[PDB]
């Protein structure tokens, strides 16, 4: 099975909303060693976001039922752990591809910031369902991946680049939900918004993507300050 045929089946799977099939196709494309193109890198990101997202949504529901209810309590607990496993298996697959193929092959600063942001993303997803001594190590792994990607983007990217703005959006989300630091979250999002606004006076062809992330940066700022 050649790479160009795996990619086509992955694009067909995205149209059919068959995201488990999409991730399996992009996983085999990545495991061939060749550096991912811009399209293939997006296909892999979209595939695993939907795959991990379905279990994330399922987890928050069964976890809330387990908390908000004896015999029925157990079944909510046991079912939540089954989803929790699935969730952990998906993240470990992504972080294995990033550690073994994606990050080592990233020769451009744009690709490095992308894969390093995604590494902090899936360590954050693990932290959402983590508890105890294990949780502390995962959270630190997520903050180190975000903080790294933050500093190549600050030195190699313009303030209006969608990858830099998207990383600042997820990094600030990490600070609010994972570290429980609303001040560091609001400061990070407000700085990225204003630096991009200041640069807007002096970007092209990425109009739609950057302005959408700028709105999400201000949306999160509005909601977080309301929790004074």
């Amino acid at each position: 099975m050649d790479k160009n045929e795996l990619v086509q089946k992955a694009k067909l799977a995205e149209q059919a909303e068959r995201y488990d099939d999409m991730a399996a196709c992009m996983k085999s494309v990545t495991e061939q060693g060749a550096e991912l193109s811009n399209e293939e890198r997006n296909l892999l990101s979209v595939a695993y976001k939907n795959v991990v997202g379905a279990r994330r949504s399922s987890w928050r529901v069964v976890s809330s039922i387990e908390q908000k209810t004896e015999k029925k309590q157990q079944m909510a607990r046991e079912y939540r752990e089954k989803i929790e496993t699935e969730l952990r298996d998906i993240c470990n697959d992504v972080l294995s591809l990033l550690e073994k193929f994606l990050i080592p092959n990233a020769s451009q600063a744009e690709s490095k910031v992308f894969y390093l942001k995604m590494k902090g993303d899936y360590y954050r997803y693990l932290a959402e369902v983590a508890a105890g001594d294990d949780k502390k190590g995962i959270v630190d792994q997520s903050q180190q991946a975000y903080q790294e990607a933050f500093e190549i983007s600050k030195k190699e990217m313009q303030p209006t680049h969608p990858i830099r703005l998207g990383l600042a959006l997820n990094f600030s989300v990490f600070y609010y939900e994972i570290l429980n630091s609303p001040e560091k979250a609001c400061s990070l999002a407000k700085t990225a918004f204003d630096e991009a606004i200041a640069e807007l006076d002096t970007s092209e062809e990425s109009y739609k993507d950057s302005t959408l992330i700028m709105q999400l940066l201000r949306d999160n700022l509005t909601l977080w300050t309301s929790d004074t």
């Binding site: 993303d121 997820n170 989300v173 609010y176 993507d209």
Partner: peptide, 6 residues
């Protein structure tokens, strides 16, 4: 509140 796929 994180980044969507667009």
């Amino acid at each position: 509140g994180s980044l969507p796929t667009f």
